[PDB]
Write a protein that binds this ligand. Sequence first.
Ligand code: Z77
Ligand code: Z77
Lengths: 603, 603
Amino acid sequence: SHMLRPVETPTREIKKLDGLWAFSLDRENCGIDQRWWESALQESRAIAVPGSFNDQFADADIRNYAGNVWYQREVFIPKGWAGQRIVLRFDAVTHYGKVWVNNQEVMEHQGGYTPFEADVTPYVIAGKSVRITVCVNNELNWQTIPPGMVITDENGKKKQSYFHDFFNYAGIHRSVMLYTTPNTWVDDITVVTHVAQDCNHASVDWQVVANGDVSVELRDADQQVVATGQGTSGTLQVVNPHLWQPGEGYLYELCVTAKSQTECDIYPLRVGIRSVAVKGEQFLINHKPFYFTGFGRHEDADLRGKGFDNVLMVHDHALMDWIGANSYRTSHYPYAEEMLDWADEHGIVVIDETAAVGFNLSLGIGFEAGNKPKELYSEEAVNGETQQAHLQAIKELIARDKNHPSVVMWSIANEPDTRPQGAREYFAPLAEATRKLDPTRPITCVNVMFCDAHTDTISDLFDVLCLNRYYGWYVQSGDLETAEKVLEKELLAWQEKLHQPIIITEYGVDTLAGLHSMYTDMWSEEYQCAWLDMYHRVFDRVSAVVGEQVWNFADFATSQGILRVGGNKKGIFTRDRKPKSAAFLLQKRWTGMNFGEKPQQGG
Amino acid sequence: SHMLRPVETPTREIKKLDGLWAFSLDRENCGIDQRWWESALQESRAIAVPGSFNDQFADADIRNYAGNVWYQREVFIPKGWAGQRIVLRFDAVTHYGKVWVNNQEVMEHQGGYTPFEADVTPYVIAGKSVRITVCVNNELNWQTIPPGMVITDENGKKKQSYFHDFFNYAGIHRSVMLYTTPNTWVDDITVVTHVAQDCNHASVDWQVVANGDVSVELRDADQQVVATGQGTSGTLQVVNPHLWQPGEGYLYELCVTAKSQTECDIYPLRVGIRSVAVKGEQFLINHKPFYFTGFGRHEDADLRGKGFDNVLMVHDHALMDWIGANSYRTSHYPYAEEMLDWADEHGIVVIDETAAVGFNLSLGIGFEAGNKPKELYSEEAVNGETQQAHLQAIKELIARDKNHPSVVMWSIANEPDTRPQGAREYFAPLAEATRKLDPTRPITCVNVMFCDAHTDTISDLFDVLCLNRYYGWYVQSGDLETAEKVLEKELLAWQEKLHQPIIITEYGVDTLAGLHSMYTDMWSEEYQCAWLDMYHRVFDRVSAVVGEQVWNFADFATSQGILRVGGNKKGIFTRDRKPKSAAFLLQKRWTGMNFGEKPQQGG
Ligand SMILES: COc1cccc(NC(=S)N(CCO)Cc2cc3cc(C)c(C)cc3[nH]c2=O)c1
Ligand SMILES: COc1cccc(NC(=S)N(CCO)Cc2cc3cc(C)c(C)cc3[nH]c2=O)c1
């Protein structure tokens, strides 16, 4: 369906993020049968929203729980909301939600990183209290967007396994809200900026609408009406403009009016005049040779999970700004939109990514019981549904982020195994369909190191080359000397194979803060520094390398294992954001360069 | 004025603690000259509210700033608020804050820890958008609670100095909000709960109204009307009751209605039926001797400073519940009211404390010779004005917290130097005023160890003896054998001197997580364990000891010096809430006792 980011004019919100809700586990899965949502959850306790449920209670049994949990809370609908449109919206519900307003089932959602909403006017009465009950599921299976497998034990209980690193946080991770609309209402919008050698340029509106006529007006930074359009379906305004750029990120505001003889609906959609596409081995934003810096990130932090948080947000960006990141990627799931609004506002370049992670079964590291399906693409394991579920996941992200100028690229998935058979048959359609959803931006699929330049059957189908590489770490462990060869050899081997522009979307080594070594070896701070030094030395000797993003901005939490010391320790910063000695090395390189500019194959 | 906590009944909030606001320093002190409230702030970066401002940007220069800062933000008055009393309320602005609505100054408050609100209807238009500038100031002086001394070097660069441990974090630490009432509205309520060997009793009630007749009903847990009342400023209700009790804190709800001829107002006040009194050396709750366990805590966490936060609150409360703590003291300043609602609901016992720490010029770190007034109680230093600003701090605190059944006593100050004559001159009238302000709870003043049983001049004026003791650590360093003899001799001296109940409100040692030692000496986890254990042996020998609150729940940021290794490490938990091994020691001692009940002098 249609997603529009709420803002506040002929519409206003009660955020329900007001944190404390009633909470409970349903270890018997008797909750739907016993119709829990008709009265107050019993045996509950306070929980905060937004945040993951897992770590709020310091309890392993809750942390590793799998199945359904219940959220409940009450809330007076504002008196002024008349006969108006009342709309309940969740920015995310991690993995799956079902919603009961008093007794009315109003909503259902699968996907954990994108919004869903419903018109609730008929079971609500403005000026009165209404119960809100949410049922939340955190289970993953094969047609799910990260896939996974729930093993039920003989003894009654579930237990989740899956194929990615990062830990399976679940819950209401983002803002909920009740919001208000006129019965005339904008409900969809799309916008495209074309650029021309940097002198002048044009933007297209298209806009689905609740019944009404659209006056479309584009405003200055200073609110001077410099673009006007008529029509409820389409326009193009060719004004000679001020562009969205990386150092600075200028933005226009396109108000959107939908009219009836009774009503009016007014919408400001921030807009960045920017063009994105690839030319040969170059990446082009406003027809310029960019160079990417920054990291893969996660939504992870002590206590809250992947739960959204303003302070955290403000601090991390301060940190990225300081250290010279111009860009980052939404590692392995759609992030809360606020990050993107900030990126636009601040001109930060974003490779936007779907939750399609862990399609891979070789990854890995198993001393344990094998199964585990034999064929990756099978009706058993990655199947028809799964391509369809996956398709739907790509719609939504694009539905949400097409209008965010900061997004210069889409990412279809991260590290799928492309050595098994259906791997090109699975990936070709979605690659086509992606561009049929948005042809304004290039599209990639992020590449695991064992589908290497001679074995990977999928890369031509995409526009840019996104590599995750560990050459001294998982292989050649500890050996910078031979690691540098393999890496360059393999970067050159990609350059000729595909003659595409190359970005390393993951390069990094586990490092324990405070571990220091005169022998400069694995897990030491010094080693991280030497290893990043080297990867760097090597992108300076390759023309096709136009992007660099460090494995992890900060240490995050993982599934429990032998290869993870209390989590992934590959952060430049610790989880509480204290900088490892490598923050200061990246500091120099990233602020020493010219903005958006590769070195002189040296410096 | 009158302070009631906003809730949603006829009443309605729009949170606006939506926390993205604009922000900047004022280094040359131009802000009030150039009427900054009049135009949108310039050179202004995004900051999260609520939060301390110091830590969100990873910048030492902002962190250590002294002077004025500005928060600015536009908002929408709900169209629905038509005939409405519209109030702008700030839960806290740390130290002083001045507020403009669009070139209309509406407020000013001095105090960093309690709310201030203004009726703003005539400066706002329902359904339009407003600009709100706050000027916040973080400086301390001899008349501020707490006190301090700004030092300006030869260059005019201000530098704050103060006499307490914890870091002077400042900013808007708690929510801001626009909220609604009718022009007939309850603006103050007061409840006193009485009880007699526990079978049934009454609640006196006093109710101040904005223009109306008042009526009153006591609704049950399951919402049934257990009693009724009429009259305005006076009533009393009798009941066969489930008392509010340390374990569980059962709550009735008192329902206040102010009626005009035209307009109507409704206010729910949670009521816990319980009595609190000292009887000799015992502290009685519902007529039963109670024994406190638990912490002095702070408002502190990474990134957000003293900024309030829901996930953090739910997590620390799971921790204290797990560990067996039945109480705490709002060390050092009034805490977020949310903290007290939680206490109310879960039956946590609280010692509520003003921000009056630092009265002492004798807790210096060493050897920066200068230079501080030589007479503590003098016109230069702690003078008639200070005593006024102190009395004010007491009033504001009690006005806020008087109906919180979780509050069982008021602490007026922490570790004042009571040796200098005039200490008694300064505190006697404060002791007196406080009792008059609330006659329903015991009163205390927390005692610093070098004011000892033979030198202290103030403790006879208060009801309960609360001692901060550090034998083995600041004095007799490392020597448990002799620390233990001195602790016991001193506690016995106090018992015989005053025959009051003794709560040790601070005892703890700095412990670096992960420093382990076979010698069981000073900064190791093993010492923290052995030291608390020695303290425990002595408490169980002394019959007037009626409570124990370990000094720190968690490590916290302090100002820099040679005694604080990046903060106070007397934490039981680290700042990121990881348990030190003393956590399991306390857990065993506190969950092993009978709930609320002093041990039998034995294991
Ligand atoms: C199931 O969730 C988990 C749990 C714990 C660890 C991981 N590891 C992950 S995601 N990575 C991918 C790094 O981008 C490390 C990894 C690299 C790797 C490289 C090669 C060349 C081979 C042959 C096998 C490999 N196996 C691996 O595990 C995943
Ligand atoms: C960062 O804020 C700062 C800065 C500088 C110093 C401190 N120190 C603090 S708060 N204390 C805590 C006292 O509860 C240690 C202390 C103990 C003490 C004991 C005796 C028996 C005597 C005679 C003198 C003493 N003086 C002290 O200072 C804190």
